Amino acid sequence: PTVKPPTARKFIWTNHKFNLSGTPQQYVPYSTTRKKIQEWVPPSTPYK
Amino acid sequence: SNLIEVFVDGQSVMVEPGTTVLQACEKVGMQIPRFCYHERLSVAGNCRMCLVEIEKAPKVVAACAMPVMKGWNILTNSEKTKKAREGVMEFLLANHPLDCPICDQGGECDLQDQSMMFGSDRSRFLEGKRAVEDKNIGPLVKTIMTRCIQCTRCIRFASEIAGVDDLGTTGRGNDMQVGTYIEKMFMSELSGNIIDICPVGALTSKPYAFTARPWETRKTESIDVMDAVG
Amino acid sequence: GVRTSPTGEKVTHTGQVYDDEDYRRVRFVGRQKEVNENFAIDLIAEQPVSQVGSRVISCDGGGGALGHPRVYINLDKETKTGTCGYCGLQFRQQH
Amino acid sequence: TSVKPIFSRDMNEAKRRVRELYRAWYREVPNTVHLFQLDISVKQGRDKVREMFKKNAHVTDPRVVDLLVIKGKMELEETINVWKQRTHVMRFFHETEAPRPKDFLSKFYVGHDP
Amino acid sequence: TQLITVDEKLDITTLTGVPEEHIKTRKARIFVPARNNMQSGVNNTKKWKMEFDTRERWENPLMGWASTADPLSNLVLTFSTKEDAIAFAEKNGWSYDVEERKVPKPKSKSYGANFSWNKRTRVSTK
Amino acid sequence: TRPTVRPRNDVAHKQLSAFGEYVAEILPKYVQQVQVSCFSELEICIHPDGVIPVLTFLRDHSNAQFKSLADLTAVDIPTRQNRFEIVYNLLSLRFNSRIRVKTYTDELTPVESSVSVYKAANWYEREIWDMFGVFFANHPDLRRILTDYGFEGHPFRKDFPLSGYVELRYDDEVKRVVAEPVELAQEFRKFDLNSPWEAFPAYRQPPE
Amino acid sequence: TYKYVNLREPSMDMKSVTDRAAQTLLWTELIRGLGMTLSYLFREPATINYPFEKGPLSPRFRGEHALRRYPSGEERCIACKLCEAVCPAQAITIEAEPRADGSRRTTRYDIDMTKCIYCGFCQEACPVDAIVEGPNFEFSTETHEELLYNKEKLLNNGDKWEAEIAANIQADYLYR
Amino acid sequence: ALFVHRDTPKNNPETPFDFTPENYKRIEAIVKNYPEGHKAAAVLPVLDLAQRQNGWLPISAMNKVAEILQVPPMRVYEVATFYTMYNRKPVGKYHIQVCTTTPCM
Numbered sequence A: 001p002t003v004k005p006p007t008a009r010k011f012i013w014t015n016h017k018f019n020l021s022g023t024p025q026q027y028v029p030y031s032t033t034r035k036k037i038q039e040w041v042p043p044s045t046p047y048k
Numbered sequence B: 001s002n003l004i005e006v007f008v009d010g011q012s013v014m015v016e017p018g019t020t021v022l023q024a025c026e027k028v029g030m031q032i033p034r035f036c037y038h039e040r041l042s043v044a045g046n047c048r049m050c051l052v053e054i055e056k057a058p059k060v061v062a063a064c065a066m067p068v069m070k071g072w073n074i075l076t077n078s079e080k081t082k083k084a085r086e087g088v089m090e091f092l093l094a095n096h097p098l099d100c101p102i103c104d105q106g107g108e109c110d111l112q113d114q115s116m117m118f119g120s121d122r123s124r125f126l127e128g129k130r131a132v133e134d135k136n137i138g139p140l141v142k143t144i145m146t147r148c149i150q151c152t153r154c155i156r157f158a159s160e161i162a163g164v165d166d167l168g169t170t171g172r173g174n175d176m177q178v179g180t181y182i183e184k185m186f187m188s189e190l191s192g193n194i195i196d197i198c199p200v201g202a203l204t205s206k207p208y209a210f211t212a213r214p215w216e217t218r219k220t221e222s223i224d225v226m227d228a229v230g
Numbered sequence C: 001g002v003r004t005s006p007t008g009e010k011v012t013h014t015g016q017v018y019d020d021e022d023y024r025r026v027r028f029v030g031r032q033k034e035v036n037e038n039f040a041i042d043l044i045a046e047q048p049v050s051q052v053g054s055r056v057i058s059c060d061g062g063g064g065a066l067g068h069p070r071v072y073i074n075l076d077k078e079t080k081t082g083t084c085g086y087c088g089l090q091f092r093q094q095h
Numbered sequence D: 001t002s003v004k005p006i007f008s009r010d011m012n013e014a015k016r017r018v019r020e021l022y023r024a025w026y027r028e029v030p031n032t033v034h035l036f037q038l039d040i041s042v043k044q045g046r047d048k049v050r051e052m053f054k055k056n057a058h059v060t061d062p063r064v065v066d067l068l069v070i071k072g073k074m075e076l077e078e079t080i081n082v083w084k085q086r087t088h089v090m091r092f093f094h095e096t097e098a099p100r101p102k103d104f105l106s107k108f109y110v111g112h113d114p
Numbered sequence E: 001t002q003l004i005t006v007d008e009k010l011d012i013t014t015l016t017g018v019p020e021e022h023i024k025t026r027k028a029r030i031f032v033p034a035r036n037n038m039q040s041g042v043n044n045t046k047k048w049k050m051e052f053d054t055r056e057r058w059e060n061p062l063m064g065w066a067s068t069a070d071p072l073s074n075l076v077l078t079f080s081t082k083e084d085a086i087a088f089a090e091k092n093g094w095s096y097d098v099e100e101r102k103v104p105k106p107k108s109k110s111y112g113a114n115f116s117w118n119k120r121t122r123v124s125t126k
Numbered sequence F: 001t002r003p004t005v006r007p008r009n010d011v012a013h014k015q016l017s018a019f020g021e022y023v024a025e026i027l028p029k030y031v032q033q034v035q036v037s038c039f040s041e042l043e044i045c046i047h048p049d050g051v052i053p054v055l056t057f058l059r060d061h062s063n064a065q066f067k068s069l070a071d072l073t074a075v076d077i078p079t080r081q082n083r084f085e086i087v088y089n090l091l092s093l094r095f096n097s098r099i100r101v102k103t104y105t106d107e108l109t110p111v112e113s114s115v116s117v118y119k120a121a122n123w124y125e126r127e128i129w130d131m132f133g134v135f136f137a138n139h140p141d142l143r144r145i146l147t148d149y150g151f152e153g154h155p156f157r158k159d160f161p162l163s164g165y166v167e168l169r170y171d172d173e174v175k176r177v178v179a180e181p182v183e184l185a186q187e188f189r190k191f192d193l194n195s196p197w198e199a200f201p202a203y204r205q206p207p208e
Numbered sequence G: 001t002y003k004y005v006n007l008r009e010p011s012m013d014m015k016s017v018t019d020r021a022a023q024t025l026l027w028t029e030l031i032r033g034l035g036m037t038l039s040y041l042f043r044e045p046a047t048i049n050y051p052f053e054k055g056p057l058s059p060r061f062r063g064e065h066a067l068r069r070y071p072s073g074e075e076r077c078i079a080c081k082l083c084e085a086v087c088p089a090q091a092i093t094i095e096a097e098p099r100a101d102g103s104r105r106t107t108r109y110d111i112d113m114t115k116c117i118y119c120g121f122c123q124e125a126c127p128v129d130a131i132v133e134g135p136n137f138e139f140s141t142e143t144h145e146e147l148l149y150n151k152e153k154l155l156n157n158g159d160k161w162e163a164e165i166a167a168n169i170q171a172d173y174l175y176r
Numbered sequence H: 001a002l003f004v005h006r007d008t009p010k011n012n013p014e015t016p017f018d019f020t021p022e023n024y025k026r027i028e029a030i031v032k033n034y035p036e037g038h039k040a041a042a043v044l045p046v047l048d049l050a051q052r053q054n055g056w057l058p059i060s061a062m063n064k065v066a067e068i069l070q071v072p073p074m075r076v077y078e079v080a081t082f083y084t085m086y087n088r089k090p091v092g093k094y095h096i097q098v099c100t101t102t103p104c105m
């Protein structure tokens, strides 16, 4: 692999981080989605 | 008296005078593949996929609007019927760009279904494929006029039932743009009905545009609200 | 171009960042919220705009049967640039 | 209308079969409740067996009644065997509530459950 | 050979193993499905589809899915006539709501009256 | 029409057609339909009373042996007053052909326990009993194969949904694995694919 | 076309019958089996030094389920839902929205690594080859929840390498 | 080519446009040849008169024709784009047309 080690792109980790699982620092998932239906805001000024 | 006999593939059936071949075929069940006919719109023989062979006729009749004379016999599955359908499907698929993923009528196209069930599979005319830039129709419709197959369904419906009288054909040949020439903001009543009557993905919904796809969603009963017509 | 939420953790390019009351904040206690450091919004802002003097021009994305297929875009408008739905990189004209 | 039945000529043979089967279920309780090493009293299980028999009381056609006799016969076969373990015998019992009664109001709080 | 038979309804509903909660709670709906009006295909007709009523599908709090407690929300049954639907629903017991089949209307169209002389039908552009 | 199209022959077609007509002639008592497939596998649609006479006739009779018993399942079809279909497949040992006996039945009225003529019928029979619910006349053993012992409902039916009504999990409270009602995390998105436009017009049933 | 065996007689001559008697009573061919086992004992075995050597594979091996992106470009996917349309466990879940820039996007791209039967159908169905069957097979996750990849998870997965993936594609774009 | 209007004043009404009352009498002869019921059939001769009065037609010429002939304006746009006489774009006073296709080339 000394013939073509890199590629000429700007996105690549220079680190080559190892198998990051089994650590205190690893992946946990979550739903990547915004607010569903924008629950209703009560009125600001108090009445009576 | 009031009954005209046609032989769809030999089978006799009674047809009222003044009606098309297509209503007879739907009476016996045959869906003739069609693009520019609509069962609630005025008829104009444009799409040419409605061809069928009646025997002892060298030409091929456009059965979208062919009236029914006395005592017919119709070959729905003749060889030149299949040849004509493969040919018209071969003509339509050149100047329609490779947009079926990014289109919004993936499960709800018409070229795709009739090209499967009627057309060829190995294309020709290896280069070409004109590109026509759209207009700014309005906030309600997202508009890509490049996929417009110029089927002239929006224009007929617009000018007759909508009566807005602004969808115009400009030019000739490959250069025939559909729409208002001077980029008027198309704002009128019933202007949202057009996004589904357009049979290809030339027109689509502006909020729905890149959200989902009809094979995921399930279909459910409801009745119209806010209007007492229902 | 990652930002910082008022809670403290990093935002995402999809606008799903947390409130002051979400408990997925408290399930992210102790471990990394693995966010991306590559935002494709500003990489298109890094991309120059080509100037091709022809009328109807092609796009492939660098490779025969590699990347996205042949899409032919139009340049007949004077001021509205030709944007590929697959590439997202615009074009100009030299007439 | 001519339909072949399973076994019987009226409901009398069906009642005969089902009460002989229930007698077999009643005599079949103590050996298996000592063998399976259970923790539920004999009265409770016997009342649940007779309550399960009384659950299907609204059936009058003798074909279906003989079919349920065949069902309970297969059940009593698999329980006179030691094939079934503690799991299915406790699965007849319903200890995993699910507490929702037929109140309208308890159905109002835990919504969408009419 | 022309044996015992008594004529009633059928009692498969105690045999099918579904509890009485989902017997009396959920209700079936029997109809001919809609023509997908963007396309023009009446091939999706001629099929009396039996469906149920949908119920709650809450969000999966970790993944964002349609977390539903509904085993019977994903069934559809294809029938030939309405009589088969009625016999099937009364066979397996739970309640049914049958809608009426609404066919299209054979409507008269003619190119000459489209392009006539003194009528108001004039497309003025084609 | 010549290249890359699956070759068929008229020879096996005419042989099986004449043989099926011959069988229908020599047994006029239970034959209803003798359909010859275009790919030359015979199907014979049959009334459910002389099933054991049919099987004793088809094990033997020296013009076609058919000593091989095979697939049988009463394939779940709704909409019919006679729902289930008992299809006994028979394969010869001397003549190399495949015939299917599709006799019809409904749910409650029993078929007549084909184990008396074929030794390999028993586990197939017990399978169909536990899975569909097809009862038998003078049958040795009806037990449950391929299912749980506490499970019920004949789950292959169109009555039965994708999921069950049971869900096993262990608890330490009552110290066992109990069955609870279903708690699905995923929708099972049923992707509807029934597209229009009638790809096979030759198989169209005549409408009203 | 049949070639059946064991139909040959033992010879009733004294020669072969006492040779079989010598085989029976004298333990000859069992010692010949011992000699066969010793002949394979004096080999050198076909093992591997596992943390140091990694065995042979294919350029078409289907592992990581990683993403790609364009040369100095945007995210490669379209949200055209073909992979979700063909995934045999419905392990794909794509909730999609467009951003305001016009280029069509997503919200949430979801692969159940629990539910993946590792076909290659989502590779062969993607028109731009956004989701790529990966080259390496090292997941070995301690927890259950971490087997549920998200979009930015797969983007950071693709940010560690592409040159391996591009080499496999460059060797494998011509056979398919 | 270039069938977007791309307004760019010298267009974008109001652009001042007019005829002659003598030309109005010409237009009365024009809709005097055609029978009643089809007053819109004179779109082609009236827009021919518009090209005779102005060497290239602007948008306000079409707007004035849409005022006069009780027509929807889009049909006027269609006929203006459709045929070959009506150079909607400015040309010289004289215009040079070199006819050459099959015998001529």
Ligand code: SF4
Pocket: B096, B097, B098, B099, B100, B103, B104, B105, B106, B109, B110, B111, B112, B147, B199, B200, B201, B202
């Ligand atoms: S309308 Fe055009 S781009 Fe859209 S699905 Fe049909 S053929 Fe494909």
Ligand code: SF4
Pocket: B147, B148, B149, B150, B151, B152, B153, B154, B155, B178, B197, B198, B199, B200, B202, B203
């Ligand atoms: S915009 Fe649509 S409906 Fe109108 S002509 Fe084009 S393809 Fe037909």
Ligand code: SF4
Pocket: G076, G077, G078, G079, G080, G081, G082, G083, G084, G094, G125, G126, G127, G128, G129, G130, G131
């Ligand atoms: S097939 Fe490819 S482009 Fe389409 S949704 Fe899946 S990953 Fe995206």
Ligand code: SF4
Pocket: G083, G086, G087, G088, G089, G091, G092, G111, G115, G116, G117, G118, G119, G120, G121, G122, G123
């Ligand atoms: S390889 Fe995995 S993610 Fe891809 S289609 Fe198959 S099961 Fe689905």
Ligand code: FES
Pocket: B034, B035, B036, B037, B044, B045, B046, B047, B048, B049, B050, B062, B063, B064, B065
């Ligand atoms: S329907 Fe399109 S031409 Fe007859």
Ligand SMILES: [Zn+2]
Pocket: C059, C060, C061, C068, C071, C084, C085, C086, C087, C088
């Ligand atoms: Zn591109």
